[PDB]
Nucleic acid binder design. Structure first.
Ligand SMILES: Cc1cn([C@H]2C[C@H](O)[C@@H](COP(=O)(O)NP(=O)(O)OP(=O)(O)O)O2)c(=O)[nH]c1=O
Ligand SMILES: [Mg+2]
Ligand code: NA
Ligand code: NA
Length: 327
DNA sequence: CCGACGTCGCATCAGC
DNA sequence: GCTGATGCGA
DNA sequence: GTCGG
């Protein structure tokens, strides 16, 4: 559907969701509001009452009441009050910095630190991740055009193959599903020398090369299997330079790679469906392996997977392109 | 009534 | 110093 | 906050 259909309601619930996660530290009440926001955003009618909305999965009594108040008054008393609360709004805002969660944002505001400005005059109280998030605060809240993602893929695939041509890299996420834009770049990486029963330098050598050609600009975290950092496309000429982008590089064992590729391709809703259907066919699916359920639920050894299709076969589904995987 | 509500690698903290 | 908990992201 | 055993 469209925005102005129930945008005022979905925005209200989205605001409410954030305050729950960031201020109240109620992660489950955060997901509840977002789930309610989603199902309403799919509802192809301009909602007339809270009761009409209550018919939907995810909308209970409390939200029905709030929807009633919004439709009747055009606003929400509790949300209006919390928007103008100095402490709460500042705590909620500081969490927009990557690295600063609700706990760190709590401490900052507790000791006077309320703003980006305030963060800037207090570098020594920010860890490495928080500094990067502050430095690229604006760039990280921007989306990446698909064309730029394609240019970014060109670089990743080229350099990865350059390090070792037996590497297998795959850009997953919404990009692989064909989205016109992405929020980040999730790269999944494997190599013949890396199985589950199987060096610890495979991920390091790839991150290193991407730093040597100056694609990777910063590093949020890095271990033997997962890399979280920052990257940037080269500036064309005197033309304005590209924003800094979030990139994740994951080293997954060969025998788990395609369960990894399938999982990190998405979408969420699709992964819910596929696993729900997988169970009723007698198989359990996590991000790593596909295992057969016994007659009492006792899972067996993981079944060999050498392609995405292999998984679809196991649960008797026709292999569907990432293009058609929103649900 | 009352627990589930996805899971886990990495950095960094609290404790010993 | 080591181990395990906690915060964070996704 | 919502759902459901
Ligand atoms: C957060 C999350 C991740 N995933 C696995 C599949 C999501 O589609 C996917 C990629 O996560 P993402 O990068 O946060 N979302 P996206 O890549 O589809 O799109 P965008 O780049 O964030 O705009 O990873 C889930 O299956 N359920 C989830 O709730
Ligand atoms: Mg992505
Ligand atoms: Na309901
Ligand atoms: Na944050």
């Amino acid at each position: 559907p469209q925005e102005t259909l129930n945008g005022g309601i979905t925005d209200m619930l989205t605001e409410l969701a954030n305050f729950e996660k960031n201020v109240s530290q109620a992660i489950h009440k955060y997901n509840a509001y977002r789930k309610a926001a989603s199902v309403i955003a799919k509802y192809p009618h301009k909602i007339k009452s809270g009761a009409e909305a209550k018919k939907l999965p995810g909308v209970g009594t409390k939200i029905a009441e709030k929807i009633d108040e919004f439709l009747a008054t055009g606003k929400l008393r509790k949300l209006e009050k919390i928007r103008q609360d100095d402490t709460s709004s500042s705590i909620n805002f500081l969490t927009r910095v990557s690295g600063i969660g609700p706990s760190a944002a709590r401490k900052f505001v507790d000791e006077g630190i309320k703003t980006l400005e305030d963060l800037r005059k207090n570098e020594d109280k920010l860890n490495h991740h928080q500094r990067i998030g502050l430095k690229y605060f604006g760039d990280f809240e921007k989306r990446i055009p698909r064309e730029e993602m394609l240019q970014m893929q060109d670089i990743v695939l080229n350099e990865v193959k350059k390090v070792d041509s037996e590497y297998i890299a795959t850009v997953c996420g919404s990009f692989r599903r064909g989205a016109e834009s992405s929020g980040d770049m999730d790269v999944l990486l494997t190599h013949p020398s890396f199985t589950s029963e199987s060096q610890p330098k495979l991920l390091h050598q790839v991150v290193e090369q991407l730093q040597k050609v100056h694609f990777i600009t910063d590093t949020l975290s890095k271990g033997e299997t997962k890399f979280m950092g920052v990257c940037q496309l080269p500036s064309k000429n005197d033309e304005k330079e590209y924003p800094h982008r979030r990139i994740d590089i994951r080293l997954i064992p060969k025998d788990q790679y395609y369960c990894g590729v399938l999982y990190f391709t998405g979408s969420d809703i699709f992964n819910k469906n596929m696993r729900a259907h997988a169970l009723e066919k007698g198989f359990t699916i996590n991000e790593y392996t596909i295992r057969p359920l016994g007659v009492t639920g006792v899972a067996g050894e993981p079944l060999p997977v050498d392609s995405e299709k292999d998984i679809f076969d196991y649960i008797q589904w026709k292999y569907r392109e990432p293009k058609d995987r929103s649900e």
